Amino acid sequence: TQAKAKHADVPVNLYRPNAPFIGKVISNEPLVKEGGIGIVQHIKFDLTGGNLKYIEGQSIGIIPPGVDKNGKPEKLRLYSIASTRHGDDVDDKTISLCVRQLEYKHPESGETVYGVCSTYLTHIEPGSEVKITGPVGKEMLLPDDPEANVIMLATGTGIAPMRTYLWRMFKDAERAANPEYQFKGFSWLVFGVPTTPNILYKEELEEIQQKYPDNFRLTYAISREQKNPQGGRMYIQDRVAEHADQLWQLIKNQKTHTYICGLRGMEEGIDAALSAAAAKEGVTWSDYQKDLKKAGRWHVETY
Numbered sequence: 615t616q617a618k619a620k621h622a623d624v625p626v627n628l629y630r631p632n633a634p635f636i637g638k639v640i641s642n643e644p645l646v647k648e649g650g651i652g653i654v655q656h657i658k659f660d661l662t663g664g665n666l667k668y669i670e671g672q673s674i675g676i677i678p679p680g681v682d683k684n685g686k687p688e689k690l691r692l693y694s695i696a697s698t699r700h701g702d703d704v705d706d707k708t709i710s711l712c713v714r715q716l717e718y719k720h721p722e723s724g725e726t727v728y729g730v731c732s733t734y735l736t737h738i739e740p741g742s743e744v745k746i747t748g749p750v751g752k753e754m755l756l757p758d759d760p761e762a763n764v765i766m767l768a769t770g771t772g773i774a775p776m777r778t779y780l781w782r783m784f785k786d787a788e789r790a791a792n793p794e795y796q797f798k799g800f801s802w803l804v805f806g807v808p809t810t811p812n813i814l815y816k817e818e819l820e821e822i823q824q825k826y827p828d829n830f831r832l833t834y835a836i837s838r839e840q841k842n843p844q845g846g847r848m849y850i851q852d853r854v855a856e857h858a859d860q861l862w863q864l865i866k867n868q869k870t871h872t873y874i875c876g877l878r879g880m881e882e883g884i885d886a887a888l889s890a891a892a893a894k895e896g897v898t899w900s901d902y903q904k905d906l907k908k909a910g911r912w913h914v915e916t917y
């Protein structure tokens with residue numbers, strides 16, 4: 615557990631469930647604006663007093679307090695790290711998460727059911743101690759290649775690892791802190807949310823787009839405000855279909871990396887769109903994609 619640093623460049627499992635790192639909540643800020651749907655909080659934790667180090671694209675576990683319905687201790691839940699390795703204040707002292715409160719239906723006994731860890735995290739007060747494990751994950755890592763093209767397909771909290779890439783790529787303080795990574799490639803974020811007030815980190819994403827118009831393109835798929843051509847609500851798969859030929863042309867570049875993150879269910883529609891585009895040039899997308907995965911250029915993390 616605490617002895618867990620005898621390997622690689624990528625930090626993994628510095629802390630494990632049997633002896634987690636006890637961090638303190640610094641802040642818990644709301645990301646969904648009035649008129650939006652649900653509760654998504656940006657939570658920042660203090661890492662001082664421990665040796666938790668991490669990089670962009672990784673996740674950490676949070677062990678919530680309490681026991682389940684069988685009286686057994688609650689197990690950890692994984693959350694994509696929402697901050698760069700340097701933390702939101704670029705001081706190498708914190709870590710942030712983007713947590714949506716899970717809440718649902720009646721055909722699952724009772725009435726409104728609240729997710730255990732997500733409700734715990736979203737209502738947590740500053741100063742509270744939290745059990746943190748990790749980091750974990752080697753599937754959503756960003757290439758060190760500054761000339762890479764990075765396609766990001768995200769829905770909801772799937773924006774979390776995207777925020778770590780984008781901040782590392784475009785924030786002034788990040789560029790001053792990472793001399794070795796001066797991004798000059800092209801990044802395209804297609805972000806699906808139900809409403810405008812639900813666009814997590816809207817002000818900052820749009821700020822990046824304004825400062826870097828040739829290096830970053832921002833595309834939204836807002837279901838309660840936009841309709842696709844078939845008359846249905848606009849989802850991320852619809853924007854992908856809309857730009858399938860373009861996305862396929864970018865994917866053909868040897869330097870292109872594609873990242874997919876969010877709730878499970880988005881993948882099938884994205885593949886269908888890219889398959890139709892790939893087919894025009896006599897390529898079977900399912901086969902091409904396996905090669906991309908093997909080459910480490912197709913990154914997916916859905917849950």
Ligand SMILES: Cc1cc2nc3c(=O)[nH]c(=O)nc-3n(C[C@H](O)[C@H](O)[C@H](O)COP(=O)(O)OP(=O)(O)OC[C@H]3O[C@@H](n4cnc5c(N)ncnc54)[C@H](O)[C@@H]3O)c2cc1C
Pocket residue numbers: 673691692693694695712713714715716717718719722728729730731732733771772774915917
């Ligand atoms: C790698 C990874 C990264 C993740 N990153 C994030 C992140 O950045 N942000 C974030 O918010 N979450 C993230 N998640 C999901 C997160 O780990 C927890 O699953 C989620 O927060 C819910 O946990 P809970 O403790 O709130 O719910 P639980 O109390 O554990 O309830 C979960 C159970 O409720 C059920 N369920 C789920 N949705 C519904 C629904 N609408 N209808 C019916 N039943 C349902 C299932 O039985 C599920 O097992 C990530 C998951 C993984 C695996």
